[PDB]
Amino acid sequence: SHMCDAFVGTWKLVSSENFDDYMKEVGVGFATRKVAGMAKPNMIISVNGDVITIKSESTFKNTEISFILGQEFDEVTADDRKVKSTITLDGGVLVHVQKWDGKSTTIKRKREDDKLVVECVMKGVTSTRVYERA
Numbered sequence: 635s636h637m638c639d640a641f642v643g644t645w646k647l648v649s650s651e652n653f654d655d656y657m658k659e660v661g662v663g664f665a666t667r668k669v670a671g672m673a674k675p676n677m678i679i680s681v682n683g684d685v686i687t688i689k690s691e692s693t694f695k696n697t698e699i700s701f702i703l704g705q706e707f708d709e710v711t712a713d714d715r716k717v718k719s720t721i722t723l724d725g726g727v728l729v730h731v732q733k734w735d736g737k738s739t740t741i742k743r744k745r746e747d748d749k750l751v752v753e754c755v756m757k758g759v760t761s762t763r764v765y766e767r768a
């Protein structure tokens with residue numbers, strides 16, 4: 635058993651709070667924000683040894699990242715930012731820091747009841763995205 639166990643599986647977006655303002659703060663343009671706003675992505679999380687893979691699959695875009703905890707990696711985000719990402723475990727929370735152009739955003743993923751809750755913070759702006767098992 636590992637702390638990442640509770641995350642593994644296929645998840646589907648069930649609700650989104652303040653996501654348009656989060657995207658604004660990150661610098662996402664109008665057209666991408668409207669398309670993002672409709673999307674109900676799936677998130678597929680798997681583990682093979684030390685390597686964690688998170689796939690995001692939506693009508694617009696399929697993204698995938700594979701990473702080792704604490705090891706920086708290159709990531710192209712859904713909105714096409716080219717960022718330097720580091721994902722660590724803080725207790726049972728996966729903490730994902732993306733850095734680009736002197737800016738930084740933090741995405742936290744945690745299990746709460748039967749949900750996987752994703753808290754996205756950019757400067758003062760927080761968004762919450764709630765996933766359920768698909």
Ligand SMILES: Cc1noc(-c2c(NC(=O)[C@@H]3CCCC[C@@H]3C(=O)O)sc3c2CCCC3)n1
Pocket residue numbers: 647656657660662666669670673675677690692694695712713741752754763
């Ligand atoms: C920022 C941004 N710009 O476009 C996006 C973005 C997504 N964002 C997410 O899915 C959120 C946002 C940050 C981490 C993951 C979280 C998730 O629900 O898995 S999904 C999606 C887009 C752009 C258009 C295509 C579909 N994000």
